[PDB]
Design a protein around this ligand. Structure first.
Ligand SMILES: Nc1ncnc2c1ncn2[C@@H]1O[C@H](COP(=O)(O)OP(=O)(O)O)[C@@H](O)[C@H]1OP(=O)(O)O
Length: 287
Protein backbone atom coordinates (compact mmCIF):
# COMPACT_ATOMS: atom_id res chain seq x y z
CA UNK A 1 0.00 0.00 0.00
CA UNK A 2 1.68 3.21 -1.18
CA UNK A 3 1.49 6.23 1.10
CA UNK A 4 1.12 9.81 -0.14
CA UNK A 5 1.20 13.34 1.24
CA UNK A 6 -2.33 14.76 1.01
CA UNK A 7 -2.13 18.55 0.82
CA UNK A 8 1.10 20.24 1.96
CA UNK A 9 0.77 20.56 5.76
CA UNK A 10 1.99 17.06 6.65
CA UNK A 11 -1.08 14.80 6.39
CA UNK A 12 -0.06 11.40 5.14
CA UNK A 13 -2.61 8.79 4.07
CA UNK A 14 -2.74 5.45 2.28
CA UNK A 15 -2.99 5.94 -1.51
CA UNK A 16 -6.39 4.30 -1.32
CA UNK A 17 -8.90 5.52 1.28
CA UNK A 18 -12.09 3.87 2.60
CA UNK A 19 -15.58 5.40 2.64
CA UNK A 20 -17.46 4.39 5.76
CA UNK A 21 -20.84 5.79 4.67
CA UNK A 22 -22.31 2.55 3.27
CA UNK A 23 -21.79 0.68 6.53
CA UNK A 24 -24.74 2.63 8.11
CA UNK A 25 -24.99 -4.65 11.24
CA UNK A 26 -22.33 -3.61 13.72
CA UNK A 27 -20.05 -6.63 14.04
CA UNK A 28 -19.99 -6.98 10.24
CA UNK A 29 -19.32 -3.28 9.75
CA UNK A 30 -16.45 -3.36 12.23
CA UNK A 31 -14.97 -6.42 10.55
CA UNK A 32 -14.86 -4.67 7.15
CA UNK A 33 -12.97 -1.71 8.62
CA UNK A 34 -10.54 -4.04 10.42
CA UNK A 35 -9.93 -5.91 7.16
CA UNK A 36 -9.48 -2.63 5.29
CA UNK A 37 -6.65 -1.81 7.72
CA UNK A 38 -5.25 -5.33 7.22
CA UNK A 39 -4.97 -4.53 3.53
CA UNK A 40 -3.07 -1.37 4.44
CA UNK A 41 -5.84 1.21 4.16
CA UNK A 42 -5.39 3.72 7.01
CA UNK A 43 -7.51 6.62 5.70
CA UNK A 44 -11.14 6.44 6.83
CA UNK A 45 -13.92 8.81 5.78
CA UNK A 46 -17.21 9.50 7.53
CA UNK A 47 -19.45 12.46 8.43
CA UNK A 48 -21.74 13.45 11.28
CA UNK A 49 -24.64 13.20 8.85
CA UNK A 50 -24.07 9.56 7.83
CA UNK A 51 -26.40 7.01 9.40
CA UNK A 52 -28.88 7.92 12.11
CA UNK A 53 -27.90 10.40 14.82
CA UNK A 54 -24.25 9.97 13.85
CA UNK A 55 -24.22 6.18 14.05
CA UNK A 56 -21.59 5.86 11.29
CA UNK A 57 -19.17 7.98 13.35
CA UNK A 58 -20.01 5.86 16.44
CA UNK A 59 -19.33 2.73 14.39
CA UNK A 60 -15.96 4.01 13.24
CA UNK A 61 -14.99 4.92 16.83
CA UNK A 62 -15.89 1.41 17.97
CA UNK A 63 -13.74 0.02 15.17
CA UNK A 64 -10.80 2.21 16.18
CA UNK A 65 -10.79 0.48 19.58
CA UNK A 66 -9.30 -2.64 17.97
CA UNK A 67 -6.91 -0.62 15.83
CA UNK A 68 -3.76 1.41 16.54
CA UNK A 69 -5.35 4.88 16.38
CA UNK A 70 -2.12 6.71 15.66
CA UNK A 71 -1.59 4.73 12.48
CA UNK A 72 -5.02 5.86 11.27
CA UNK A 73 -6.19 9.06 9.59
CA UNK A 74 -9.76 9.82 10.64
CA UNK A 75 -11.66 11.97 8.17
CA UNK A 76 -15.04 13.30 9.23
CA UNK A 77 -17.27 16.31 8.45
CA UNK A 78 -19.84 18.85 9.67
CA UNK A 79 -22.12 21.27 7.84
CA UNK A 80 -25.38 19.55 6.96
CA UNK A 81 -27.89 20.77 9.53
CA UNK A 82 -31.14 19.26 8.30
CA UNK A 83 -32.41 17.46 5.21
CA UNK A 84 -35.98 18.24 4.16
CA UNK A 85 -38.11 18.35 1.02
CA UNK A 86 -36.69 21.74 -0.04
CA UNK A 87 -33.23 20.16 0.03
CA UNK A 88 -30.00 20.41 2.03
CA UNK A 89 -29.54 23.15 4.61
CA UNK A 90 -25.93 24.06 5.39
CA UNK A 91 -24.74 25.87 8.51
CA UNK A 92 -21.28 27.39 8.96
CA UNK A 93 -21.60 29.53 12.08
CA UNK A 94 -18.48 29.27 14.31
CA UNK A 95 -20.64 27.98 17.14
CA UNK A 96 -22.00 25.20 14.94
CA UNK A 97 -18.46 24.46 13.75
CA UNK A 98 -17.35 24.07 17.36
CA UNK A 99 -20.42 22.17 18.58
CA UNK A 100 -20.19 19.81 15.60
CA UNK A 101 -16.50 19.09 16.22
CA UNK A 102 -17.07 18.28 19.90
CA UNK A 103 -19.97 15.98 19.10
CA UNK A 104 -17.79 14.16 16.54
CA UNK A 105 -14.95 13.80 19.04
CA UNK A 106 -17.41 12.30 21.52
CA UNK A 107 -19.05 9.89 19.04
CA UNK A 108 -15.70 8.76 17.59
CA UNK A 109 -14.36 8.70 21.17
CA UNK A 110 -11.06 10.29 20.08
CA UNK A 111 -8.87 13.10 21.37
CA UNK A 112 -8.45 14.52 17.87
CA UNK A 113 -9.66 14.34 14.27
CA UNK A 114 -6.97 14.18 11.59
CA UNK A 115 -8.97 15.80 8.79
CA UNK A 116 -12.12 17.78 9.50
CA UNK A 117 -14.15 18.92 6.47
CA UNK A 118 -16.89 21.45 5.81
CA UNK A 119 -19.37 19.04 4.22
CA UNK A 120 -21.51 21.67 2.52
CA UNK A 121 -20.86 25.36 2.01
CA UNK A 122 -23.07 27.79 3.98
CA UNK A 123 -23.79 30.41 1.28
CA UNK A 124 -25.15 32.89 3.86
CA UNK A 125 -21.89 33.02 5.81
CA UNK A 126 -18.53 34.37 4.59
CA UNK A 127 -16.13 31.46 4.21
CA UNK A 128 -13.52 33.31 6.27
CA UNK A 129 -15.77 33.01 9.30
CA UNK A 130 -16.25 29.26 9.20
CA UNK A 131 -12.53 28.77 8.39
CA UNK A 132 -11.57 31.03 11.32
CA UNK A 133 -13.15 28.69 13.85
CA UNK A 134 -11.57 25.62 12.17
CA UNK A 135 -8.26 27.45 12.34
CA UNK A 136 -8.82 27.76 16.09
CA UNK A 137 -9.59 24.04 16.39
CA UNK A 138 -6.30 23.29 14.68
CA UNK A 139 -4.51 25.43 17.29
CA UNK A 140 -6.25 23.72 20.21
CA UNK A 141 -5.27 20.39 18.66
CA UNK A 142 -8.87 19.19 18.36
CA UNK A 143 -8.35 18.77 14.62
CA UNK A 144 -5.08 18.58 12.68
CA UNK A 145 -6.06 19.36 9.10
CA UNK A 146 -8.89 21.15 7.30
CA UNK A 147 -10.88 19.98 4.32
CA UNK A 148 -13.49 21.38 1.99
CA UNK A 149 -16.16 19.48 0.16
CA UNK A 150 -17.77 20.56 -3.13
CA UNK A 151 -16.57 24.14 -2.80
CA UNK A 152 -16.54 26.98 -5.31
CA UNK A 153 -13.13 28.09 -6.57
CA UNK A 154 -13.85 31.49 -4.97
CA UNK A 155 -14.59 29.63 -1.74
CA UNK A 156 -11.43 27.57 -2.09
CA UNK A 157 -8.97 30.48 -2.51
CA UNK A 158 -10.69 32.51 0.19
CA UNK A 159 -10.67 29.61 2.67
CA UNK A 160 -7.05 28.83 1.90
CA UNK A 161 -6.05 32.44 2.58
CA UNK A 162 -7.34 32.15 6.16
CA UNK A 163 -5.80 28.72 6.78
CA UNK A 164 -4.31 26.09 4.42
CA UNK A 165 -6.81 23.66 2.99
CA UNK A 166 -5.42 20.12 3.25
CA UNK A 167 -7.96 18.38 0.94
CA UNK A 168 -10.88 18.95 -1.41
CA UNK A 169 -13.39 16.10 -1.51
CA UNK A 170 -15.37 16.12 -4.81
CA UNK A 171 -17.01 13.69 -7.20
CA UNK A 172 -14.53 12.48 -9.82
CA UNK A 173 -14.47 9.35 -11.98
CA UNK A 174 -14.51 8.35 -15.67
CA UNK A 175 -18.13 9.45 -15.68
CA UNK A 176 -17.74 12.82 -13.97
CA UNK A 177 -14.69 14.86 -14.98
CA UNK A 178 -15.86 18.47 -14.58
CA UNK A 179 -13.29 19.34 -11.88
CA UNK A 180 -10.50 18.92 -14.45
CA UNK A 181 -11.18 22.21 -16.21
CA UNK A 182 -10.27 24.57 -13.39
CA UNK A 183 -10.76 22.86 -10.01
CA UNK A 184 -7.83 20.48 -10.45
CA UNK A 185 -5.32 23.04 -11.78
CA UNK A 186 -6.38 25.29 -8.89
CA UNK A 187 -5.84 22.66 -6.20
CA UNK A 188 -2.39 21.92 -7.63
CA UNK A 189 -1.38 25.55 -7.68
CA UNK A 190 -2.45 25.86 -4.03
CA UNK A 191 -0.98 22.46 -3.13
CA UNK A 192 -4.32 21.05 -1.98
CA UNK A 193 -4.91 17.28 -2.00
CA UNK A 194 -7.76 15.86 -4.07
CA UNK A 195 -10.17 13.28 -2.66
CA UNK A 196 -12.68 11.72 -5.09
CA UNK A 197 -15.87 10.21 -3.73
CA UNK A 198 -18.05 7.96 -5.89
CA UNK A 199 -14.99 7.00 -7.95
CA UNK A 200 -16.80 3.84 -9.02
CA UNK A 201 -20.39 3.95 -7.74
CA UNK A 202 -21.67 6.08 -10.60
CA UNK A 203 -20.15 3.76 -13.19
CA UNK A 204 -21.60 0.71 -11.45
CA UNK A 205 -25.11 2.19 -11.48
CA UNK A 206 -24.62 3.10 -15.16
CA UNK A 207 -23.23 -0.33 -16.06
CA UNK A 208 -26.14 -2.09 -14.37
CA UNK A 209 -28.72 0.06 -16.20
CA UNK A 210 -27.18 -0.76 -19.59
CA UNK A 211 -27.02 -4.45 -18.66
CA UNK A 212 -30.77 -4.39 -18.00
CA UNK A 213 -19.44 -0.03 -21.90
CA UNK A 214 -18.21 -2.97 -23.97
CA UNK A 215 -15.31 -0.70 -24.80
CA UNK A 216 -14.54 -0.40 -21.06
CA UNK A 217 -15.01 -4.15 -20.45
CA UNK A 218 -12.72 -4.88 -23.40
CA UNK A 219 -10.11 -2.53 -21.89
CA UNK A 220 -10.39 -4.08 -18.42
CA UNK A 221 -9.80 -7.48 -20.10
CA UNK A 222 -6.83 -6.05 -22.01
CA UNK A 223 -5.32 -4.94 -18.70
CA UNK A 224 -6.16 -8.16 -16.87
CA UNK A 225 -8.59 -6.77 -14.29
CA UNK A 226 -12.32 -6.21 -13.79
CA UNK A 227 -14.22 -3.13 -15.12
CA UNK A 228 -14.69 -1.65 -11.66
CA UNK A 229 -10.94 -2.10 -11.03
CA UNK A 230 -10.18 -0.33 -14.32
CA UNK A 231 -12.38 2.60 -13.36
CA UNK A 232 -10.71 2.84 -9.98
CA UNK A 233 -7.22 2.47 -11.46
CA UNK A 234 -7.98 5.34 -13.85
CA UNK A 235 -8.75 7.61 -10.87
CA UNK A 236 -5.66 6.52 -8.97
CA UNK A 237 -3.52 7.46 -12.02
CA UNK A 238 -4.76 11.07 -12.16
CA UNK A 239 -2.09 12.26 -9.74
CA UNK A 240 0.10 11.56 -6.72
CA UNK A 241 -2.16 14.08 -4.99
CA UNK A 242 -5.30 12.02 -5.70
CA UNK A 243 -6.72 9.74 -3.00
CA UNK A 244 -10.12 8.13 -3.73
CA UNK A 245 -12.42 6.82 -1.00
CA UNK A 246 -14.58 4.08 -2.47
CA UNK A 247 -16.78 2.25 0.03
CA UNK A 248 -18.12 -1.29 0.27
CA UNK A 249 -20.04 -3.52 2.69
CA UNK A 250 -18.47 -6.67 1.27
CA UNK A 251 -15.03 -8.02 2.17
CA UNK A 252 -14.79 -9.50 -1.34
CA UNK A 253 -15.26 -6.15 -3.11
CA UNK A 254 -12.84 -4.56 -0.65
CA UNK A 255 -10.12 -7.01 -1.79
CA UNK A 256 -11.16 -6.28 -5.35
CA UNK A 257 -10.72 -2.54 -4.75
CA UNK A 258 -7.30 -3.04 -3.15
CA UNK A 259 -6.31 -5.14 -6.16
CA UNK A 260 -6.84 -2.04 -8.33
CA UNK A 261 -3.48 -0.85 -6.97
CA UNK A 262 -1.70 -3.49 -9.08
CA UNK A 263 -3.22 -2.17 -12.29
CA UNK A 264 -0.53 -0.09 -13.94
CA UNK A 265 -1.40 2.21 -16.79
CA UNK A 266 0.79 4.15 -19.21
CA UNK A 267 -0.13 7.65 -20.35
CA UNK A 268 -1.23 5.94 -23.57
CA UNK A 269 -3.30 3.41 -21.60
CA UNK A 270 -4.95 6.33 -19.82
CA UNK A 271 -5.76 8.39 -22.91
CA UNK A 272 -7.18 5.26 -24.52
CA UNK A 273 -9.47 4.84 -21.52
CA UNK A 274 -10.57 8.50 -21.46
CA UNK A 275 -11.18 8.56 -25.22
CA UNK A 276 -13.42 5.51 -24.78
CA UNK A 277 -15.75 7.44 -22.48
CA UNK A 278 -16.43 10.85 -24.02
CA UNK A 279 -20.71 -18.68 -41.19
CA UNK A 280 -19.12 -15.99 -43.24
CA UNK A 281 -22.08 -14.18 -41.61
CA UNK A 282 -20.89 -15.07 -38.14
CA UNK A 283 -19.76 -11.39 -37.92
CA UNK A 284 -19.93 -9.61 -34.53
CA UNK A 285 -20.64 -5.97 -33.64
CA UNK A 286 -17.42 -3.86 -33.70
CA UNK A 287 -16.31 -1.90 -30.60
N1 LIG B 1 -15.41 -4.11 -6.12
C1 LIG B 1 -16.78 -3.72 -6.27
N2 LIG B 1 -17.54 -4.28 -7.22
C2 LIG B 1 -18.83 -3.92 -7.38
N3 LIG B 1 -19.38 -2.99 -6.60
C3 LIG B 1 -18.67 -2.38 -5.63
C4 LIG B 1 -17.34 -2.74 -5.45
N4 LIG B 1 -16.86 -1.99 -4.43
C5 LIG B 1 -17.85 -1.19 -3.99
N5 LIG B 1 -18.96 -1.44 -4.72
C6 LIG B 1 -20.24 -0.80 -4.63
O1 LIG B 1 -20.14 0.52 -5.16
C7 LIG B 1 -20.78 1.43 -4.29
C8 LIG B 1 -19.87 2.47 -3.70
O2 LIG B 1 -19.07 3.26 -4.53
P1 LIG B 1 -18.65 4.75 -4.14
O3 LIG B 1 -18.01 4.84 -5.56
O4 LIG B 1 -17.81 4.13 -2.96
O5 LIG B 1 -20.20 4.83 -3.95
P2 LIG B 1 -21.01 6.14 -3.90
O6 LIG B 1 -21.48 6.46 -5.30
O7 LIG B 1 -22.18 5.90 -2.98
O8 LIG B 1 -20.18 7.29 -3.36
C9 LIG B 1 -21.51 0.54 -3.29
O9 LIG B 1 -22.79 0.33 -3.74
C10 LIG B 1 -20.80 -0.70 -3.26
O10 LIG B 1 -21.69 -1.75 -3.06
P3 LIG B 1 -21.29 -3.01 -2.21
O11 LIG B 1 -21.39 -2.70 -0.72
O12 LIG B 1 -22.24 -4.16 -2.52
O13 LIG B 1 -19.87 -3.44 -2.54
Amino acid sequence: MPRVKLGTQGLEVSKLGFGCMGLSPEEQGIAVIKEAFNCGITFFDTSDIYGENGSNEELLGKALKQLPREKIQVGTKFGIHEIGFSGVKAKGTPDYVRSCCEASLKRLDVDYIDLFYIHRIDTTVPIEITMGELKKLVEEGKIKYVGLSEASPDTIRRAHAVHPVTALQIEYSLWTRDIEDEIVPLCRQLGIGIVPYSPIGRGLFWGKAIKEYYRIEALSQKHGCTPVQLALAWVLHQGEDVVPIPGTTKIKNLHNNVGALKVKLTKEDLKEISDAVPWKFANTPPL
